[PDB]
Design a protein around this ligand. Structure first.
Ligand SMILES: NC(=O)c1ccc[n+]([C@@H]2O[C@H](COP(=O)([O-])OP(=O)(O)OC[C@H]3O[C@@H](n4cnc5c(N)ncnc54)[C@H](O)[C@@H]3O)[C@@H](O)[C@H]2O)c1
Ligand SMILES: CC(=O)[C@H]1CC[C@H]2[C@@H]3CCC4=CC(=O)CC[C@]4(C)[C@H]3CC[C@]12C
Length: 364
């Protein structure tokens, strides 16, 4: 039987992996699940049969401390990251985080079969600062085209992973590059759905219109996204399928959409009146929601929500970052040609993840 390690279990995809791995019908199930994180176990992670572990993977001592006793690990799911001012600092911080984990697991786990590493569609468009500013390859992005000639901590992590798996015969790897992730995790540093839900709940409480905080290309152009549960199934599939070993795969829901339509979905789900894209405005939730923490705590008590601080639940800079730029699509041909036929209805996923945030009483 298989034993999984989820590096970043309170994450947006780690929480999906924590919910799906111990399922009875999950491939290679039953699954024993260790889940690594720093914070204490929150309230939306409590009803899963997961063996929680508190550890800062940037500290090589706590990583040797907490992970050396773990003997039975068969598969590893690295699904965390760290943000810094420049991309060079992200290469250093995230390379060391992945290295500390692998230095421990590979020798101290005799049955280690697979390591799956989650990167992203930034692999193709470049780091945050350079996005829209550098000549990329032409979309839709395919997995095995040359890397951009710029720094990128996805590149740094991939090279590291390739060297580390060599230290064990029959050790095998996979990397998964999702688009914007539709999922549920209040602790996530990039939870787009949760951020858009809070902005809709604040527009509702104030009687103001849900205005689009982005550009016309995100409003009127084609967009796609990656469902968190679908990314989890994508990890598990590559972890257990030997015809997907040592390969990089995109993972997106399989359909496109326009935030023009999704806005009315978001508007319908919170009772707000849908606003349209206003030209020559360039509205930023980071600016628009400045100093609105009292309004949030007013919403929380008036709707019996869970005790949440606006900063944790809404990452305005991320939301602004995604809606201010056009959406270049990726291709799911390589995954489908290797036998992964999973998919999601992006509209239904959006509603589904909105309703999960409502269900856990994070938004009204
Ligand atoms: N969030 C997104 O929308 C998004 C979309 C595309 C690709 N990505 C890529 O997915 C990968 C993972 O992102 P995410 O968004 O799933 O993560 P996340 O922010 O949603 O959650 C990360 C998880 O790891 C844990 N954690 C963070 N710091 C830690 C540390 N120092 N030590 C141990 N654990 C730690 C957190 O507690 C959290 O549980 C990243 O490389 C990201 O580039 C994310
Ligand atoms: C709808 C949209 O604007 C999305 C589609 C492709 C997405 C970008 C490319 C993929 C992506 C992944 C990340 O983890 C950081 C933000 C970026 C860089 C995304 C920001 C928002 C974009 C541009």
């Amino acid at each position: 039987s298989s034993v999984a390690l989820i590096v970043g279990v309170t994450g947006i995809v780690g929480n999906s992996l924590a919910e799906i791995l111990p399922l009875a019908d999950t491939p290679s199930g039953p699954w024993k699940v260790y889940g690594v994180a720093r914070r204490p176990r929150p309230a939306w992670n409590e009803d899963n049969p997961i063996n929680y572990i508190r550890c800062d993977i940037s500290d090589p001592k706590d990583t040797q401390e907490k992970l050396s006793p773990l003997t039975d690990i068969t598969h590893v799911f690295y699904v965390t990251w760290a943000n810094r001012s420049t991309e060079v600092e992200r290469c250093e911080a995230n390379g060391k985080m992945l290295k500390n984990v692998l230095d421990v697991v590979i020798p101290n786990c005799p049955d280690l079969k697979h390591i799956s590493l989650q990167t992203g569609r930034k692999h193709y468009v470049g780091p945050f600062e350079l996005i829209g500013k550098i000549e990329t390859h032409d979309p839709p992005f395919t997995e095995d085209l040359p890397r951009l000639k710029f720094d990128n901590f996805y590149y740094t992590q991939e090279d590291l992973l390739f060297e580390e798996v060599e230290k064990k015969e029959g050790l095998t790897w996979s990397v998964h590059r999702p688009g914007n992730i539709f999922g549920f995790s209040p602790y996530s540093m990039m939870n787009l759905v949760g951020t858009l839900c809070v902005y809709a709940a604040i527009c509702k409480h104030e009687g103001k219109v849900l205005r689009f905080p982005g550009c016309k290309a995100a409003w009127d152009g084609y967009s796609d996204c990656s469902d968190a549960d679908l990314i989890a199934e994508h990890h598990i599939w590559a972890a257990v399928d030997p015809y997907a070993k040592n390969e990089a795969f995109n993972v997106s829901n399989g359909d496109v959409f326009k935030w023009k339509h999704f806005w009315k979905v978001l508007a319908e789900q919170f009772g707000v009146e849908c606003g349209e894209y206003e030209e020559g405005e360039n509205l930023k939730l980071q600016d628009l929601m400045k100093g609105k923490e009292p309004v949030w705590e007013e919403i929380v008590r008036e709707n019996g929500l869970a005790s949440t601080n606006l900063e944790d639940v809404a990452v305005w800079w991320f939301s602004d970052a995604v809606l201010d730029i056009p959406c270049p699509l990726d291709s799911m041909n390589k995954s489908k040609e290797h036998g992964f036929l999973g998919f999601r209805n992006s509209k239904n996923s959006f509603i589904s993840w909105i309703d999960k945030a409502k269900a856990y009483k994070i938004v009204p």
